[PDB]
Coordinates of C-alpha atoms and ligand atoms in Angstrom, one line a residue:
Chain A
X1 CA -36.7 -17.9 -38.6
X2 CA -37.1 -20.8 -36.3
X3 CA -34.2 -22.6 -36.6
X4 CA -32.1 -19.3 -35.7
X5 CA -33.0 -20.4 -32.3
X6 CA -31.7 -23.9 -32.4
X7 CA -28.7 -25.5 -30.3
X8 CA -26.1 -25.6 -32.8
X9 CA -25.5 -22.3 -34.0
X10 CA -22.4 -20.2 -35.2
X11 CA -20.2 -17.9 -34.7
X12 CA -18.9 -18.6 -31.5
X13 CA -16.0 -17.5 -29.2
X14 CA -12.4 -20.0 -29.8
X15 CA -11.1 -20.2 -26.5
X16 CA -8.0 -22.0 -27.6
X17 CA -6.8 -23.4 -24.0
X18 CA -10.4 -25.7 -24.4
X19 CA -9.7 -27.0 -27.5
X20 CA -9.2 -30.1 -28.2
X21 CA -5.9 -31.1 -30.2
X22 CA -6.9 -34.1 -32.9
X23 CA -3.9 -35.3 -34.8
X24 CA -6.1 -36.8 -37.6
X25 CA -6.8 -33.5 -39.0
X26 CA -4.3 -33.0 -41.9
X27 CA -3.7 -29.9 -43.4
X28 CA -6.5 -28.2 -45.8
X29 CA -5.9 -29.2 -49.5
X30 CA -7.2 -26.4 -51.9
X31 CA -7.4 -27.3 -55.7
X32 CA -8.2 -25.0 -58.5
X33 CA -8.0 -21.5 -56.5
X34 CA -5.3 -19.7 -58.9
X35 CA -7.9 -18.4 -61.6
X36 CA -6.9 -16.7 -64.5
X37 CA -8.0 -13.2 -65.7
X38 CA -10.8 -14.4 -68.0
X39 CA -14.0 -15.1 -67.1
X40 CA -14.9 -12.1 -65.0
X41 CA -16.8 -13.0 -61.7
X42 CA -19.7 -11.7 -60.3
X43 CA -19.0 -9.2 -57.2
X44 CA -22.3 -8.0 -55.8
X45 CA -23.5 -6.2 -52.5
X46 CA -27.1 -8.0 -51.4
X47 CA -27.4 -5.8 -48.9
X48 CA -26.1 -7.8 -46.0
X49 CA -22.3 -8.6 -47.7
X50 CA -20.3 -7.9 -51.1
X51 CA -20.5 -11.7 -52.5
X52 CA -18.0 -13.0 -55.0
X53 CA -19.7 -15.9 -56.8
X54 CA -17.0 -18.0 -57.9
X55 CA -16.6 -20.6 -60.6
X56 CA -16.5 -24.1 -61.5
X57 CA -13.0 -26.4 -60.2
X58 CA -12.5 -24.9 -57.2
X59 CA -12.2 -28.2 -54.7
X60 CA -11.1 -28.4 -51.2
X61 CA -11.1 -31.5 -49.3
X62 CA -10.8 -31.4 -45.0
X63 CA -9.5 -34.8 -45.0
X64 CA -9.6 -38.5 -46.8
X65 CA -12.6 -38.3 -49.4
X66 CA -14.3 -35.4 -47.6
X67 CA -14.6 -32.8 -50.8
X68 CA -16.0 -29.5 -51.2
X69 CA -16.2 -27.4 -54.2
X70 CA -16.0 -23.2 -53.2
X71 CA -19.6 -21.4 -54.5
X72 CA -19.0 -17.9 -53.0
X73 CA -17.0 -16.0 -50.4
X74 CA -18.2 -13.1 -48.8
X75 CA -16.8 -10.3 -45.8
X76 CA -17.8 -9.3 -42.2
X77 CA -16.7 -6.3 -41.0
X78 CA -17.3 -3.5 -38.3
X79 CA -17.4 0.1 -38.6
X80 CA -15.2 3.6 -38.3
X81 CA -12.5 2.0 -35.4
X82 CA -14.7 -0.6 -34.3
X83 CA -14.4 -4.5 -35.0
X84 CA -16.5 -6.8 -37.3
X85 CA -15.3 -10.2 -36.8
X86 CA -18.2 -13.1 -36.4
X87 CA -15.7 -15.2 -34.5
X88 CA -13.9 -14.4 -31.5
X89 CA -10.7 -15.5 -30.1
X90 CA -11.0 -15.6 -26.1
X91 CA -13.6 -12.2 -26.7
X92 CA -11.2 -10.7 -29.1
X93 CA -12.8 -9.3 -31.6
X94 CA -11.2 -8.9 -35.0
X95 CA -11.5 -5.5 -37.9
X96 CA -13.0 -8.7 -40.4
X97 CA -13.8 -11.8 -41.2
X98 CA -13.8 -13.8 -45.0
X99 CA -15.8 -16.7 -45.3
X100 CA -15.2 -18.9 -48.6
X101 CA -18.3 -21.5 -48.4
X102 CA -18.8 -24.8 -49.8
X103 CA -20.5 -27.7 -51.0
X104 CA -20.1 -31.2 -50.3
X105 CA -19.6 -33.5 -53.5
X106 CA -21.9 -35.9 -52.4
X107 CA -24.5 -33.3 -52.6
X108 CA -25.7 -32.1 -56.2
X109 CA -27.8 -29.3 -54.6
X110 CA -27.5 -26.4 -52.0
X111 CA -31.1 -27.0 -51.0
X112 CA -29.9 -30.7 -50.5
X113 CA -27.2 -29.9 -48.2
X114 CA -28.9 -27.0 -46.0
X115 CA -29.4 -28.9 -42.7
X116 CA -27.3 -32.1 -43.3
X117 CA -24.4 -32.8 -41.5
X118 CA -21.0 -31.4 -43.4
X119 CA -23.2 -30.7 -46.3
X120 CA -21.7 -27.6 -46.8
X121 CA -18.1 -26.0 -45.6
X122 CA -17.1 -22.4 -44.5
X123 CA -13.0 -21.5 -44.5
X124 CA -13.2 -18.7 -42.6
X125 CA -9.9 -16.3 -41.8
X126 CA -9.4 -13.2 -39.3
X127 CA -8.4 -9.7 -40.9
X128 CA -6.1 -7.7 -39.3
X129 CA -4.4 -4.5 -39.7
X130 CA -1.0 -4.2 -41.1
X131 CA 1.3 -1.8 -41.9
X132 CA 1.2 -2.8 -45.8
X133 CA -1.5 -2.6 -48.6
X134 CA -3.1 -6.5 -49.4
X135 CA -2.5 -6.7 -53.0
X136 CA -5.2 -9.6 -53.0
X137 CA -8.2 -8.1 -51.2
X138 CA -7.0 -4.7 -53.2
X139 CA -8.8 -6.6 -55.9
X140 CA -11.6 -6.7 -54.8
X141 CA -12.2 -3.2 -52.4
X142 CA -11.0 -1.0 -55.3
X143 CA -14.5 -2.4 -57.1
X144 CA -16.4 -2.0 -53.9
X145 CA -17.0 1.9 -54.9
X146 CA -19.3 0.6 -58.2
X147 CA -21.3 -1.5 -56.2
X148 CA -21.9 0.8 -53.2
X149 CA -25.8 0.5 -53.8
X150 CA -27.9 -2.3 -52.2
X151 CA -28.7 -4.9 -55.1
X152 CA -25.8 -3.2 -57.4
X153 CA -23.0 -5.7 -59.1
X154 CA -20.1 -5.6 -61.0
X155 CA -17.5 -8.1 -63.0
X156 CA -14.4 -8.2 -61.8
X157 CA -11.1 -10.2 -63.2
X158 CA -10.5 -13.6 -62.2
X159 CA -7.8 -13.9 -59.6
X160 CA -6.0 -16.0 -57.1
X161 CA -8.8 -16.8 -54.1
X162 CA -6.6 -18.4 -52.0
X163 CA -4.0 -15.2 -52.0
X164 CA -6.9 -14.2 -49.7
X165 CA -6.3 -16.8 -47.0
X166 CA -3.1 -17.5 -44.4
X167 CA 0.1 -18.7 -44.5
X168 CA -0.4 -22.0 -42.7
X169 CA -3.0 -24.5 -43.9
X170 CA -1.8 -26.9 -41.3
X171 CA -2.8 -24.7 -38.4
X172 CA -6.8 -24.3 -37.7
X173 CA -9.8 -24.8 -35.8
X174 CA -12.9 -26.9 -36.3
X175 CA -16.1 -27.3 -35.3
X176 CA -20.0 -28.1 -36.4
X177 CA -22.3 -24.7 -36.6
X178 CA -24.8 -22.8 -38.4
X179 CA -25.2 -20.0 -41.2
X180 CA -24.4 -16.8 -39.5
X181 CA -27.8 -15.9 -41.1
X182 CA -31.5 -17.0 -42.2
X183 CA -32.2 -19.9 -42.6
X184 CA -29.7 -20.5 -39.6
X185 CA -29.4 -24.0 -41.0
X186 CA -27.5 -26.1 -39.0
X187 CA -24.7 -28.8 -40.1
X188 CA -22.3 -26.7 -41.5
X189 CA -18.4 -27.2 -41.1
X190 CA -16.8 -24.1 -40.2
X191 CA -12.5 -24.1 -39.9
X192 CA -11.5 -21.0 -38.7
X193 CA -7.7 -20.4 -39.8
X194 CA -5.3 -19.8 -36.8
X195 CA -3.2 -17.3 -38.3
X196 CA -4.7 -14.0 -39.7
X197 CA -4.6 -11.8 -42.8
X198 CA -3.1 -8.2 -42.4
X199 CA -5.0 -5.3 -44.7
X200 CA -3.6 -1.6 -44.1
X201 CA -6.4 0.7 -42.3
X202 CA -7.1 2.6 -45.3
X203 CA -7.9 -0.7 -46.8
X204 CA -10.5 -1.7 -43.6
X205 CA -11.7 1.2 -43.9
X206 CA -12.8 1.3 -47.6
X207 CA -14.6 -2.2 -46.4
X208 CA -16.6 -0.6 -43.7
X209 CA -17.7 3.0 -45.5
X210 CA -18.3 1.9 -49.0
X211 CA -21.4 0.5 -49.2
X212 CA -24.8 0.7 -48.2
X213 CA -27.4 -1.6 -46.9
X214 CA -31.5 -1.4 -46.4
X215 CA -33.6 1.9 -46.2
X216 CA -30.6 4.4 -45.6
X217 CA -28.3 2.7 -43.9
X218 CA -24.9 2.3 -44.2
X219 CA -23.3 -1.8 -44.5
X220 CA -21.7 -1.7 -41.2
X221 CA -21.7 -4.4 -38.6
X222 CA -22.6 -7.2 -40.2
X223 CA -21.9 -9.6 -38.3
X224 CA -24.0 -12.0 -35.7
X225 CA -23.8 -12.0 -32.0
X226 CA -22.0 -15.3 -30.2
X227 CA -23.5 -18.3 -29.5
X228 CA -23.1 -20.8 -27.3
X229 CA -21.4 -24.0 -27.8
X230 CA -23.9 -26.5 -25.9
X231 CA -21.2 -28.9 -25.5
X232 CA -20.1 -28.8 -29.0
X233 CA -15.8 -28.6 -28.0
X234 CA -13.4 -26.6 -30.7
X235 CA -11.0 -28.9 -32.3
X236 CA -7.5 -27.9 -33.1
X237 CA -4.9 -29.3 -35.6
X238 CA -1.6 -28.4 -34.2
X239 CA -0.9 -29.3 -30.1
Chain B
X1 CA -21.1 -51.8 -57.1
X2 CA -18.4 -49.6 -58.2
X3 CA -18.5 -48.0 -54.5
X4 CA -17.3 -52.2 -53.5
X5 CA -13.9 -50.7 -54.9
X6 CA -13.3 -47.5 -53.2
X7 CA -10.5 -45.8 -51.7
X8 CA -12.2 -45.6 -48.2
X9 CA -13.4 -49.0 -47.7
X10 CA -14.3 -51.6 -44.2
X11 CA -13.5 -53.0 -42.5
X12 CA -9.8 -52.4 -41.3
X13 CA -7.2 -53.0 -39.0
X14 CA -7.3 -51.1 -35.9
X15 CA -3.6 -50.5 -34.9
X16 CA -4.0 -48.7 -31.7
X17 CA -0.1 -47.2 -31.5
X18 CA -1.2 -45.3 -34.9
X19 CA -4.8 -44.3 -33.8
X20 CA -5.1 -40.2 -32.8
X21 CA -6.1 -39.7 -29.3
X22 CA -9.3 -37.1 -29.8
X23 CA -10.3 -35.5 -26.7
X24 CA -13.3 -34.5 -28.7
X25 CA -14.7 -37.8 -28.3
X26 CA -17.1 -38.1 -25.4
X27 CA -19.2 -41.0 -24.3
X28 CA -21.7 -42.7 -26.5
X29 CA -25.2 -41.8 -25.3
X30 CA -28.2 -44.0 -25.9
X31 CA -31.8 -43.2 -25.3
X32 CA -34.8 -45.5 -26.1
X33 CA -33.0 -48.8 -25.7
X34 CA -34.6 -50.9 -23.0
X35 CA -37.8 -51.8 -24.9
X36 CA -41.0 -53.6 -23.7
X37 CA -41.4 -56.7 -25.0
X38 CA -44.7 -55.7 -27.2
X39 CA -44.2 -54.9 -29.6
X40 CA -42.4 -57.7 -30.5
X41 CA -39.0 -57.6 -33.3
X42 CA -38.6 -59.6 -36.5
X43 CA -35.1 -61.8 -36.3
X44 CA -34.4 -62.7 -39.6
X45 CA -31.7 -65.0 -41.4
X46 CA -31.1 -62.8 -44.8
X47 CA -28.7 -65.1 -45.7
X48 CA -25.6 -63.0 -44.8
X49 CA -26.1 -63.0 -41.9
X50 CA -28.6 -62.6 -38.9
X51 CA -30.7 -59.0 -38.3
X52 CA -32.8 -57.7 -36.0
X53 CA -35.1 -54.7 -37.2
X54 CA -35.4 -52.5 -34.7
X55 CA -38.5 -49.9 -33.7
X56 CA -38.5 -46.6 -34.1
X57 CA -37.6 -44.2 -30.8
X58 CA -33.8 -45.9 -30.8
X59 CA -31.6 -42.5 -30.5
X60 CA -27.8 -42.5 -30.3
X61 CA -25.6 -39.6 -30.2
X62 CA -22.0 -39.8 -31.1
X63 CA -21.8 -35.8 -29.8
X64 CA -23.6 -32.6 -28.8
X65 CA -25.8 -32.0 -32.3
X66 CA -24.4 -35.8 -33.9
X67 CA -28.2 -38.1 -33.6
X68 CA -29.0 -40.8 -35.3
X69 CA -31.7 -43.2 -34.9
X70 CA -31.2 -46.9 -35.0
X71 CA -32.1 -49.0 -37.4
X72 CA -31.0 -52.8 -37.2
X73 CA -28.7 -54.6 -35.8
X74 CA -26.7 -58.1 -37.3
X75 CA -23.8 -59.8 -36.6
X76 CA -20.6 -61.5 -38.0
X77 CA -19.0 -64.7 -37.1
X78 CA -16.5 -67.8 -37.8
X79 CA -16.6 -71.5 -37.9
X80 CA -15.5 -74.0 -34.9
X81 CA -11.8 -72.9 -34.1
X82 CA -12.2 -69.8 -36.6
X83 CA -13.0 -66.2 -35.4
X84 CA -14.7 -64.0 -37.9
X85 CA -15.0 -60.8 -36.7
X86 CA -15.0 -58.3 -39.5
X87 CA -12.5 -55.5 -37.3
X88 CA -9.1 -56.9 -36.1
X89 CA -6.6 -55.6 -33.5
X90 CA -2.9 -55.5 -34.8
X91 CA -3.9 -58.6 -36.9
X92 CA -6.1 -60.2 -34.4
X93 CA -9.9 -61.2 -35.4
X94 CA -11.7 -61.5 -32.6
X95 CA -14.7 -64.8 -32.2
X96 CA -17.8 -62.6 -33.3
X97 CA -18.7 -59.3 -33.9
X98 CA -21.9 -56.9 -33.5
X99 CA -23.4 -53.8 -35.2
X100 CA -26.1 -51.8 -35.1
X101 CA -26.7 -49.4 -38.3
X102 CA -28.2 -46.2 -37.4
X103 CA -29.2 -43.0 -39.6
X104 CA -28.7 -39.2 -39.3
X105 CA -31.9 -38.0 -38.0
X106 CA -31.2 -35.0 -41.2
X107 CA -32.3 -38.2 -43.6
X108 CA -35.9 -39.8 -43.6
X109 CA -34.3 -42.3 -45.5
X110 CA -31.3 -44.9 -46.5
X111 CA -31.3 -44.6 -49.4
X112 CA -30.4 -40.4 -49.3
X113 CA -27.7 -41.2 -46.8
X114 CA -26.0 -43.2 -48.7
X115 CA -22.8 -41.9 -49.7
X116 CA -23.3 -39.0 -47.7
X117 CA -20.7 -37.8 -45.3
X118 CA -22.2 -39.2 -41.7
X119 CA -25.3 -40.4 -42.7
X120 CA -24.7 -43.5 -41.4
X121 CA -23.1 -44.8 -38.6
X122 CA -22.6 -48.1 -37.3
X123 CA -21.5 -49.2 -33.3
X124 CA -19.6 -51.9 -33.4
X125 CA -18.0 -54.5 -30.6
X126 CA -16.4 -57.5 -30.8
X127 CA -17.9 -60.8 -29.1
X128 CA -15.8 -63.0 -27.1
X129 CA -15.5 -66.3 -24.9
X130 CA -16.7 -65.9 -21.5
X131 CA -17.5 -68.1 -18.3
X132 CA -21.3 -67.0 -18.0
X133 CA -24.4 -67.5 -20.4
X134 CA -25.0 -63.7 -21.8
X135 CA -28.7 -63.6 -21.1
X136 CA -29.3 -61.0 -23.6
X137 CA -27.7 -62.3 -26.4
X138 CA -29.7 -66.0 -25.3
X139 CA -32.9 -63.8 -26.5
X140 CA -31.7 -64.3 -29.9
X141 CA -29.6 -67.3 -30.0
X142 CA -32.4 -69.7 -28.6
X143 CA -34.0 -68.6 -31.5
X144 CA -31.7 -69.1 -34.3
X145 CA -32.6 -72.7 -35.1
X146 CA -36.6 -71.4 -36.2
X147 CA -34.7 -69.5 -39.1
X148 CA -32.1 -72.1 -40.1
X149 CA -33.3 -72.0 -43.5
X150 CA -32.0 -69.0 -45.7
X151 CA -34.7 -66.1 -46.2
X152 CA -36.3 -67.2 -42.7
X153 CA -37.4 -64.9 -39.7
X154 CA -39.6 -65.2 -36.6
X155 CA -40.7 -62.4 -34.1
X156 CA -38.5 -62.0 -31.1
X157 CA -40.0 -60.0 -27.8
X158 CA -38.5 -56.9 -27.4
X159 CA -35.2 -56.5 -25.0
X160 CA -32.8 -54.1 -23.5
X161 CA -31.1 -54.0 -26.9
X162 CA -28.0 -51.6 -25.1
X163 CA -27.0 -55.1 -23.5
X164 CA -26.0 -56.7 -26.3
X165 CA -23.4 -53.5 -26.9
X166 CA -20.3 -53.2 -23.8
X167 CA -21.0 -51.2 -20.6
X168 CA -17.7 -48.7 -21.3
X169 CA -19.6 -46.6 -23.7
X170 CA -16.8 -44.0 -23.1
X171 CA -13.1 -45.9 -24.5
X172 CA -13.9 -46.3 -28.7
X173 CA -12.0 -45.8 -31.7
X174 CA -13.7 -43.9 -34.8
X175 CA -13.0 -43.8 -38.6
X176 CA -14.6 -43.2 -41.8
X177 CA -15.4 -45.7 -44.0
X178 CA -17.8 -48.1 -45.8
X179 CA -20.9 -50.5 -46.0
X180 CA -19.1 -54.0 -46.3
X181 CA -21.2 -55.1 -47.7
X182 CA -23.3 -54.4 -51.5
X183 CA -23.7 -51.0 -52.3
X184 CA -20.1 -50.7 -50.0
X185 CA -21.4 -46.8 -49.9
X186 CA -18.6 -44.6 -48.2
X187 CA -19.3 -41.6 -45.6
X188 CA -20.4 -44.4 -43.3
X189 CA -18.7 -43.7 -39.8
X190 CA -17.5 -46.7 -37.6
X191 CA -17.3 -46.7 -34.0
X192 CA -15.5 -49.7 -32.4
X193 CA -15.3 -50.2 -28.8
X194 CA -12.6 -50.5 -26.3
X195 CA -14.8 -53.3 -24.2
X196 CA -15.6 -56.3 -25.6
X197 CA -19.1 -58.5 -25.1
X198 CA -18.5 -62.3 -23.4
X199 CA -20.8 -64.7 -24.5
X200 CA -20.5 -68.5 -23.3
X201 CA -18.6 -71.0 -25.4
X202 CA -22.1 -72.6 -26.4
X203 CA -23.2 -69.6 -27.5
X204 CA -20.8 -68.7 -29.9
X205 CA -21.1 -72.1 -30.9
X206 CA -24.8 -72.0 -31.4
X207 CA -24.3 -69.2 -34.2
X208 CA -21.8 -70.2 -35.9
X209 CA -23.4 -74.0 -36.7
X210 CA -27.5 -73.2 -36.3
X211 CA -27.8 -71.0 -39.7
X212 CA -27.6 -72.0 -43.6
X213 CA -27.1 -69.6 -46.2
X214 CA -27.0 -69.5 -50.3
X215 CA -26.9 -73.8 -52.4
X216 CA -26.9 -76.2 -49.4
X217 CA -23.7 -73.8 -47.5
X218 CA -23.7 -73.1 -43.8
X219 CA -23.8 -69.4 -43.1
X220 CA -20.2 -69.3 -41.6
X221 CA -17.2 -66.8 -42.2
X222 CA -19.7 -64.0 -43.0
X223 CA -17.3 -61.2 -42.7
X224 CA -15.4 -58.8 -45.8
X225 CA -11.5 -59.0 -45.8
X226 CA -10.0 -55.9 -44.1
X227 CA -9.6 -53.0 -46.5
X228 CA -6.5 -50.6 -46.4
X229 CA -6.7 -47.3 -44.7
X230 CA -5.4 -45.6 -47.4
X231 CA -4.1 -42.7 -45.4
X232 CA -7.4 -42.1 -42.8
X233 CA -6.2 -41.6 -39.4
X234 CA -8.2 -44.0 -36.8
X235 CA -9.3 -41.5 -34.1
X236 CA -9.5 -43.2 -29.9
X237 CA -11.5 -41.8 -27.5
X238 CA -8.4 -42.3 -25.0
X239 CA -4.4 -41.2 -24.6
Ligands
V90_301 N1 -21.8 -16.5 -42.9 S1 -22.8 -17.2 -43.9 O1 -22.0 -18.1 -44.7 O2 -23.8 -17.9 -43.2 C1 -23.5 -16.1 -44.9 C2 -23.8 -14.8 -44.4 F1 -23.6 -14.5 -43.1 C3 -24.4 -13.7 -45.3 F2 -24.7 -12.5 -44.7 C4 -24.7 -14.0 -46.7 S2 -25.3 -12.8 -47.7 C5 -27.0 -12.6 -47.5 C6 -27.8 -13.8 -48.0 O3 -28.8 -14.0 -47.0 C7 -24.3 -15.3 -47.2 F3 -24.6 -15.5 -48.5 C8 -23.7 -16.4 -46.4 N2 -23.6 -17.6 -46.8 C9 -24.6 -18.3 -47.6 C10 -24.1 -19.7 -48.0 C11 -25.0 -20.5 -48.9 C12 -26.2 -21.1 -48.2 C13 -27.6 -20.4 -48.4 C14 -27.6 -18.9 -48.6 C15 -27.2 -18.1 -47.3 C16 -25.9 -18.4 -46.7
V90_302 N1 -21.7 -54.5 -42.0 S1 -22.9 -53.8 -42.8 O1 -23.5 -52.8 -41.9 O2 -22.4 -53.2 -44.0 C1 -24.0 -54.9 -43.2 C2 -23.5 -56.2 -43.6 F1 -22.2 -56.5 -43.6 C3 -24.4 -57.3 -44.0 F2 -23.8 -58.5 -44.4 C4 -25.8 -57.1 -44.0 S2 -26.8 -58.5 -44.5 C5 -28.1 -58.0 -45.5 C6 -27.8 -57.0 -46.6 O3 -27.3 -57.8 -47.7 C7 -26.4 -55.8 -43.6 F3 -27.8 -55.7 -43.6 C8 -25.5 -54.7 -43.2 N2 -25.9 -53.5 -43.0 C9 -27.0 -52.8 -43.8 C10 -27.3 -51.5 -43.1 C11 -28.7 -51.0 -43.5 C12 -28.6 -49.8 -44.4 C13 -27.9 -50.1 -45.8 C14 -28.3 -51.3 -46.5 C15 -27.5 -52.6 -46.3 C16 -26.4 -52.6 -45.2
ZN303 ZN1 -20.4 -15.3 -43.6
ZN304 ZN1 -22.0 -55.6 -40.5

């Protein structure tokens, strides 16, 4: 894939001493994430994540009348004591990595918005290890054993998507990138929260050993290399 | 239009003291400007005002991965002792004022940027009394009395079209806004410059009493009230 090879890509290393402090970016406004038990979504490992397809209603905006609605989130994560984060903070590498992406309202189509500029939006949020169980993402790893096969799904209960993100909404980073994967199409918001998530290690580790991928493999390390930045600068929302 | 009445609308009053410093914002960067003078332009008085079309090969970056390819250019103006600039500083409407329409080189066309976040974006500068005869902006102004007449045009030989814009590419504000003019589409994003263009008191008379527009009207005071800004933050290039 060509365009895997093009100037603009993600993930890429936050070095936050370069960044550049914008106070015009407001704090994230999610709409619509508290979901009730009924319908069931569809949880399904593709063989390169486990994918939550989620449902109409979800809307985010990342400022004045720029609105998103969520489609999916999905995980990255590493393998037996070894990280999985995409993004890195000054070559930190982090256990995981969530990414909820969206799609731009002025855009009907995900075909449409692959390649335009803010056509579609990732929220994207560092996993840590804590020393408590995440009642949130226990929701969804306690399925994760039902869908260990490549191509398997499941339906799991509604629930409360942005439970799965950090405290502060006010507190992130910013820049223009790239899927993480094919088609590598570029034009894609990415804001990477500042704080992190804290899962318990039996919790990471029921991330990393449950499923499998293509061939025998095990769905481990799914995550891309760094890329550069070209000149593209980080922004920040808080000084 | 219904998108005449939006929430996000141009033009607006720049009040620098409220404006975000954005480090993010590096210098414009034009390539393709200075044109030979075949193959010659079409100058036309549309009746709103005068536009130059402009070849393809015109590239503008507002960033690293941000290109956009010119399209036009057109200008607004007053009356004898009236500015009509369409922009204002803390209240103050400037003599004249330029722009030049460009679109994201993700869209073959204007009509799918529209509406979409950053398809468009417009440079703009305000036009001022100075002591000299701006020789690049006498290109076009010599000509304004061939298209008098509403609906008119004549060809133009090509010029360095980069010195009708300032020389401090680097000290701009930028928002988000709107067309101001029918369809008023929003995603449309505005830079204004720091700098301002001189042209000679002649000049400025010259187009504000050579062109006629719609009935037996001079085409005079062609600029759109200034629109609220509703809660967008201006963003400056500078502390
Ligand atoms: N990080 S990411 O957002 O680029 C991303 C992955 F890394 C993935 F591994 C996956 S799963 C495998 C599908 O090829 C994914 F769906 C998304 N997101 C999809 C968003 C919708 C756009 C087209 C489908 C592929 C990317
Ligand atoms: N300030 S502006 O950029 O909104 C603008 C005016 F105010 C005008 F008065 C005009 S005059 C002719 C159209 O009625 C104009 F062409 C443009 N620009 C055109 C850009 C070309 C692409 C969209 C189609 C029309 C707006
Ligand atoms: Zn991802
Ligand atoms: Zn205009």
């Amino acid at each position: 894939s060509p365009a895997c090879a093009g100037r603009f890509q993600s993930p890429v290393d936050i070095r936050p001493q370069l960044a550049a402090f914008s106070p015009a970016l407001r704090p994230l406004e999610l709409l619509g994430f508290q979901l009730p038990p009924l319908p069931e979504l569809r949880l399904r490992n593709n063989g390169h994540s486990v994918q939550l397809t989620l449902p109409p209603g979800l809307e985010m905006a990342l400022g004045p009348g720029r609105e998103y609605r969520a489609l999916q989130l999905h995980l990255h994560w590493g393998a037996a004591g070894r990280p999985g984060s995409e993004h890195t903070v000054e070559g930190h590498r982090f256990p995981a990595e969530i990414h909820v992406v969206h799609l731009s309202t002025a855009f009907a189509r995900v075909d449409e918005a692959l390649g335009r500029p803010g056509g579609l939006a990732v929220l994207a949020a560092f996993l840590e290890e804590g020393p408590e169980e995440n009642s949130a993402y226990e929701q969804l790893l306690s399925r994760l054993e039902e869908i260990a096969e490549e191509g398997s799904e499941t339906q799991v209960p509604g629930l409360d998507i942005s439970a799965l993100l950090p405290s502060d909404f006010s507190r992130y980073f910013q820049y223009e990138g790239s899927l993480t994967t094919p088609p590598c199409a570029q034009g894609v918001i990415w804001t990477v929260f500042n704080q992190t998530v804290m899962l318990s290690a039996k919790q990471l580790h029921t991330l990393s050993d449950t499923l499998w991928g293509p061939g025998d493999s095990r769905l481990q390390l799914n995550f891309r290399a760094t890329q550069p930045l070209n000149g593209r600068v980080i922004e920040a929302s808080f000084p």
